[PDB]
Design an enzyme around this catalytic site. Structure first.
Site, short mmCIF file in Angstrom:
data_model
loop_
_atom_site.label_atom_id
_atom_site.label_comp_id
_atom_site.label_asym_id
_atom_site.label_seq_id
_atom_site.Cartn_x
_atom_site.Cartn_y
_atom_site.Cartn_z
N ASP A 1 0.79 -1.24 0.00
CA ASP A 1 0.00 0.00 0.00
C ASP A 1 0.83 1.30 0.00
OD1 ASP A 1 -2.57 -0.92 -0.38
OD2 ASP A 1 -3.31 -0.07 1.48
O1 LIG Z 1 1.56 -2.51 2.43
C1 LIG Z 1 1.38 -3.61 3.27
C2 LIG Z 1 0.02 -3.48 3.91
O2 LIG Z 1 -0.19 -2.12 4.14
C3 LIG Z 1 -1.39 -1.86 4.84
O3 LIG Z 1 -1.63 -0.46 4.79
C4 LIG Z 1 -0.98 0.37 5.70
C5 LIG Z 1 0.54 0.41 5.55
O4 LIG Z 1 1.22 -0.68 6.13
C6 LIG Z 1 1.11 1.68 6.21
O5 LIG Z 1 2.45 1.86 5.88
C7 LIG Z 1 0.32 2.94 5.92
O6 LIG Z 1 0.83 4.09 6.55
O7 LIG Z 1 -0.95 2.69 6.37
C8 LIG Z 1 -1.62 1.78 5.58
C9 LIG Z 1 -3.08 1.85 6.01
O8 LIG Z 1 -3.72 2.90 5.35
C10 LIG Z 1 -2.61 -2.55 4.24
O9 LIG Z 1 -3.73 -2.57 5.10
C11 LIG Z 1 -2.36 -3.98 3.80
O10 LIG Z 1 -3.45 -4.38 3.04
C12 LIG Z 1 -1.07 -4.03 3.03
O11 LIG Z 1 -0.86 -5.32 2.51
#
Ligand SMILES: OC[C@H]1O[C@@H](O[C@H]2[C@H](O)[C@@H](O)[C@H](O)O[C@@H]2CO)[C@H](O)[C@@H](O)[C@@H]1O
Ligand SMILES: OC[C@H]1O[C@@H](O[C@H]2[C@H](O)[C@@H](O)[C@H](O)O[C@@H]2CO)[C@H](O)[C@@H](O)[C@@H]1O
Lengths: 822, 822
Positions: free
Chosen positions: B490
């Site tokens: 993400d």
């Molecule tokens: O990217 C891996 C994982 O990310 C998740 O979103 C998070 C992310 O880890 C974080 O860095 C960011 O600041 O916040 C987001 C949430 O908005 C996500 O939920 C997973 O689906 C994804 O695989």
């Protein structure tokens, strides 16, 4: 009982104990950088935007309240204490906090060591500065280590308290133990990415050590009051990586008996041009040039003292437009200092952050921008002119208004939108008051767009016409204005019909159409409709003016017939055309807003105070018998004891609180002004004293909140907590009470053609002199006042008796002496 | 070092000190009512919706952490202490907390008084129950006063902690000292208006007194650790009106030596139909019938003990589907208990509330709903089937998906929207795993709408088709899938280009068009594209299946050519078609996600582990050299040390945290599965141990978080905090690790036509037996394992040797014995 005394000479409220009924705060900063500062050093600071630019973290609803702020831990032979009492709560031999204009001092003494801290935000600086004076008041030698402390916020205060899954890995600092003028810490979270700004926290001497990780300074399982590093007596030199960054330095201080040491601490907000963000080619090191420059301006006590002097000069010079000297020290201090200070703080802070408002929401009511202006326009007319154009630029082309204005982007709030039908008339309120104060009719010719659309510019006057015509084209079956989502009372939502938790009462409309009308907007339309007509006539639009007056006359008739319940004005007709605020009902029989506002507009006023038959007098008598208490007037009576699904938020409050039976201080002035209008000055002054801080100081234990500023809400007679206030500081109560006392009780008020002098204050103020600077001239207005109901002032101007109550404006530079007898 | 130990016989983690590196929590509740409970009794409870139905208040980022929860102040002769240690922190002679499956017990002893509390949410109940046992362990008589304490939340947690201007005036309670079974306190804020629910806090004995006002119970200036009422020794009988409602009862307990007393406390959520809200005609008194009925169900220790036994029966019977018995107690306890527990918890709690997620946001990733299902489908197949139908019903008609799904409303998040191009394929992943587990091909025939529009229903299979085709119609210049806003990562936002703080990195797109491609979605399409093909074939759609295979073959070729950097797979092409994840660059040379996922899909796999030349082997050898650390594999290497504006969130993290060089555990399994695929079982098992809780227990001081559940993120090698975890419990790491160990290391995995048995675990697990219940039959699989690379199991089924690794599904009720040699 009391917890402090006023110091009129110094213009300070002096709090003489830590143990107040609630934290009492002051506001630092007059430009873009602001601090909230309690009498226990609690609170926080931000640059411009309290949601997105907060430097330092603060916890609302903490246990105990207000545990967190700017601390200085004194380690004296292993004994640790803070002069702010909180958070350590060690017994102090002496404690005092003084809140003044734009600065506060807090002093604590324990076991022969006194620490005084001066807090302020200098003119022309984006920083909070501390001047700290440590004194050995014992007969023995002292050798101390002082640990400063501030807990940083990760800038976006909403993200900071909600998005830990990301933000516990982003905290970053740099440490600079050898800074050119002492030692400094840089909080630089997200400077690596999109932020062009960081914070600096520094001291004007070589620190023995430092800490930037909160968990290390405080220690696991400890509160701020049990911080491990101070107890251990040495800084852990912790470098934060994620979690909770902080600013702390340790400074060694050795003192012979009677000797003092001064230290200056700086919390600074620093921005760099993008092309100048980094010191190094690899872009790992923040460019500190600007931070060093700031720190060099507060390297010494002499610089700091001079900056402090310049701050006081600013406030002393600003408060030079309206003062009173009387037999009543309480009246004088409210009028000359505190009421005017509070009005300025409202302009600067909008409704962003107090100890009740949390700094996350960033707009304020469109109606409140205008009303706040009524109370600061005499102080900052140039700024007021700009604010009027900025808000009018958001207005829709059909005359409707964004309900909420966002002063940081100068845009209306799109999520909330429009449909609150009193909003557009307040723009006329704002502009007329501006023009009466300044004489600047040229603001009416300024080019002003609709909804900020380039190319849509029309004269500001044309905006006033669209505000006026909006009400004309939006009336219901009785000729009263349609209320829409709500009027001034945002809790009176007759087009809502909500039975689902979480639905906004202000914006949810589960039924469309209906015929709901407001007598408050009617009254508003009579008062500001005439002010519009006068401006149209002076503009030379004789036909526009006269048509406007015709509409105002019809509205007057409607109020006195369909809007009139028999002994007071109705409040409204609901969605289905049923009356609200009638004596036919068991609850909500009489509501305060119509009674005060309608009579302010001249509606139903008779031959004089003795004319009991006059609707205006019947209504105000009703208010006195049914709404008035020892703590002010409640909003309606009786309060609703069950949820009224057809009225929205109003009945959701338990009786005696907020809009359901609370004393909503903001609207109390409309009745006070009404009472001066009908000629009952003693009653008017009485109502004023009931809710005014200086007069409530004797009951601080009941009021609970600050004894030096107005609050929004005082619990009403139907509440167990009746008398206790909530929501101090940020409220239009400040503007309306200043208008009331300056222009109607004391009776000195700007007009297009002169200065009106129409005191109506009753017998409790037998003599007073107002000094008013208006249009570049000084008016010295001496009043000898019998206080008799219905007696109005006869003026002698420069020794010669004159007819009427209007003093012609004298040329800039003049002094005009006006003697008044009543 | 450690702070406790596993108790496998009790299925509990035993915490033997208060002084853990971090608060360690458990989840109570298996239905609509849930609690977060730390080993110091901290946390809170909510019914269904943690944002808007929160019973009790909890402070994130408190100083100290976790100071607030369900407390029992013991006053023994004036000395006050709490068996949960916090908040008082009095020295305890004994302390132990045991977290089990759905309940915990916390025990504290001090000066001859022991207090054990069992916390659980019963099956069929919307309440948290405490069974409290107080024992006099001294040789002297004891006379005690016990003060219970819980702090209420004003239901809507977002409002609670932001909207004080209103909500400091709406707290209401009712007090019932003489309740049919003891004494009860009712928190009924907003019951007056739109809420049909209230909370009850009660005790099964006559309380000597009570308190419902926090400020009175705790006292001004005090922390929860210094609460005045307990220190005074008698309740203040405070009745709340606004401010901060609490539940507290004092109970008098006198004990001879060796004597014990049992008390049962209930915190209950109670809902009345509208026509049944009120006890009285005047509608001032809550109807308490349902509350009294709850309380009558927990009036005695016997009822309570029986409810506790039924909760253990629930979890024991639930976890009867997959188990292993080996020489390795750590493997066994993860596989049999903790991993599958954590998987049930993620389904129940979604991504709502942990000690890192704050319970305000209510959605979870559409991609995470599918992935979580991979790990719970063997336990709750019926619930899984429904979840697939629910999420697919939100899918767009063009095959795209809502990025965020809201389980409470079963709708997609409109504000977030769509455009994350990996999302649609995960629906195929979910459905295939479901159908393989159950044999229920009938799910594909279910009528399923698009974006929840009545009338748009098509067979679930057709939803899979639009998922598969979405990728086909959205490919870049190299034939790789366009990435859109991001893929599984993400924080890889190649269409963002943000330089403004506060812009969402996931939804902000400051440039349109471009050609950015993802190799992760390529690999995903190869793996799940084939699975779709197999489903269409079985469905009898030969043309569709073969055609899908054609597209998959093409994607494979793209991965191995345009997607291949030489020694590993590229990560992506950016907006302008420049490569990301290439050895040509200084930073972000290799990214984990495509190496693991491509090889799981069979891309580049050669003749065996012997074939070094095979791209799958080159890629995994690169992952081992460049990304593998003692704590697991980091996401990419090197981490970016400056902001990469063209890549969005990823480089905003300091090196070694989250998506910038963090060990993002969720993704480690893809490489572990890949390593079993290429036949390197010892390496696979090694990687598995590096991130798995039972194996990280002996380094609890480094890991910091719970030693019994997976966490999302362990700090990587480029961070000073390398080894320390954040974001425990709510993470797809759980499902993916359970799939990995159960189906790939242990090697027991369901297919459409039988059960595959293909263990690849290396020499460290020479023998083990798996008991698996599948399609109604029990398979006892006994494995003798040399652990040699590339050696795969030869199976004897019921005593007769068979060819291949596929065991035909036996009829329900059968036992099948499989013996495996490798
Ligand atoms: O990217 C891996 C994982 O990310 C998740 O979103 C998070 C992310 O880890 C974080 O860095 C960011 O600041 O916040 C987001 C949430 O908005 C996500 O939920 C997973 O689906 C994804 O695989
Ligand atoms: O109605 C008086 C006053 O209300 C202010 O709105 C508040 C309101 O007091 C409160 O009860 C409700 O819960 O919240 C709203 C804010 O959304 C409003 O700002 C004033 O303009 C208005 O005159």
């Amino acid at each position: 009982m009391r917890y402090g005394h006023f110091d009129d000479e110094a213009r300070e409220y002096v709090i003489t104990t830590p143990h107040t009924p609630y934290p009492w705060i002051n506001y630092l900063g007059s430009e873009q950088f602001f601090s909230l500062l309690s009498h226990q050093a609690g609170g926080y600071s931000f640059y411009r935007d309290a949601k997105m630019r907060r430097l330092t973290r603060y916890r609302y609803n903490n246990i105990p309240a207000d545990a967190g702020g700017r601390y200085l831990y004194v380690n004296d032979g292993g004994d640790v204490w803070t002069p702010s009492w909180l958070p350590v709560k060690a017994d102090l031999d002496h404690f005092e906090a003084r809140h003044g204009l734009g600065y506060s001092t807090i002093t604590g003494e324990r076991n022969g060591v006194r620490v005084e801290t001066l807090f302020f935000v200098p003119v022309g600086e984006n920083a909070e500065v501390q001047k700290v004076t440590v004194t050995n008041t014992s007969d023995s030698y002292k050798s101390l280590t002082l640990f400063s402390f501030v807990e940083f916020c990760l800038w976006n205060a909403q993200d900071d308290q909600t998005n830990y899954q990301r933000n516990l890995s982003i905290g970053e600092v740099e440490v600079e133990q050898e800074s050119p003028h002492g030692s400094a810490i840089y909080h630089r979270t997200e400077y690596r990415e999109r932020r062009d700004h960081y914070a600096v926290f520094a001291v004007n001497t070589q620190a023995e050590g430092f800490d930037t990780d909160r968990d290390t300074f405080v220690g696991a399982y400890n509160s701020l009051g049990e911080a491990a590093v101070p107890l251990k007596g040495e800084s852990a030199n912790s470098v934060a990586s994620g979690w909770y960054p902080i600013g702390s330095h340790s400074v060694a201080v050795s003192l012979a008996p009677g000797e003092s040491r001064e230290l200056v601490y700086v919390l600074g907000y620093v921005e760099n041009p993008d092309e100048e963000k980094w010191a190094d080619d690899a872009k790992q090191v923040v460019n500190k040039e600007r931070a060093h420059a700031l720190l060099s301006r507060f390297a010494t006590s002499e610089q700091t003292d001079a900056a402090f002097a310049a701050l006081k000069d600013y406030w002393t010079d600003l408060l030079s437009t309206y003062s009173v000297s009387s037999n009543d020290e309480k009246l004088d201090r409210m009028v000359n200092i505190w009421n005017q200070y509070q009005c300025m703080v409202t302009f600067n802070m909008s409704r962003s952050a107090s100890f009740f408002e949390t700094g996350i929401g960033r707009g304020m009511g469109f109606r409140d921008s205008n009303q706040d202006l009524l109370g600061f326009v005499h102080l900052i007319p140039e700024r007021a002119r700009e604010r009027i154009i900025d808000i009018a630029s958001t207005q829709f082309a059909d005359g409707s208004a964004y309900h909420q204005y966002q002063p940081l982007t100068k845009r209306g709030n799109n999520d909330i939108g429009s449909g609150f039908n009193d909003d557009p008339l307040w723009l006329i309120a704002g502009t007329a008051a501006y023009i009466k104060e300044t004489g600047d009719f040229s603001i009416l010719d300024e080019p002003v767009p609709f909804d900020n659309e380039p190319g849509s510019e029309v004269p500001l006057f044309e905006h006033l016409t669209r505000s006026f015509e909006f009400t004309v084209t939006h009336r219901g079956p009785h000729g009263l204005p349609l209320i829409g989502r709500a009027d001034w009372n945002d809790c009176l939502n007759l087009n809502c019909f909500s039975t689902t938790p979480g639905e906004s009462f202000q914006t949810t409309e589960n039924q469309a159409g209906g015929v709901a009308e407001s007598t408050f907007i009617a009254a508003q339309f009579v008062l500001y409709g005439e002010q519009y007509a006068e401006l149209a006539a002076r503009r030379g639009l004789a036909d526009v003016a006269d048509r406007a007056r015709g509409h105002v006359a019809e509205m007057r008739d409607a109020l006195l017939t369909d809007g009139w319940d028999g002994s007071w004005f109705l409040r409204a007709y609901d969605y289905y055309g049923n009356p609200i605020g009638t004596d036919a009902h068991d609850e909500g029989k009489i509501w305060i807003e119509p009674q005060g506002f309608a009579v302010m507009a001249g509606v139903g006023v008779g031959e004089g105070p003795q004319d009991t038959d006059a609707p205006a007098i019947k209504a105000l008598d009703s208010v006195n018998e049914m709404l008035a208490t020892d703590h002010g007037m409640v909003l309606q009576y009786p309060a609703y004891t069950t949820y009224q699904v057809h009225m929205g938020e109003v009945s959701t409050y338990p009786p005696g609180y907020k809009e359901n039976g609370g004393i909503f201080c903001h609207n109390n002035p409309w009745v006070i002004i009404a009472e001066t209008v009908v000629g009952r000055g003693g009653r008017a002054f009485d109502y004023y004293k009931r809710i005014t801080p200086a007069y409530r100081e004797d009951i601080s234990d009941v009021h609970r909140l600050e004894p030096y500023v107005y609050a929004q809400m005082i619990a009403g007679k139907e509440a167990v907590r009746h008398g206790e206030a909530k929501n101090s500081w940020l409220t239009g109560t400040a503007a309306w009470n200043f208008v009331t006392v300056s222009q109607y009780l004391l009776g000195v008020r700007p007009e297009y053609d002169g200065l009106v002098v129409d005191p109506q204050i009753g017998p409790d103020v037998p003599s007073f002199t107002v000094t008013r600077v208006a249009r570049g001239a000084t008016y010295e207005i001496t009043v000898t006042n019998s206080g008799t109901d219905g007696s109005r002032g006869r003026l002698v101007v420069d020794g010669t008796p004159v007819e009427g109550n209007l003093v012609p404006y004298a040329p800039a530079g003049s002094t005009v002496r006006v003697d008044v007898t009543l």
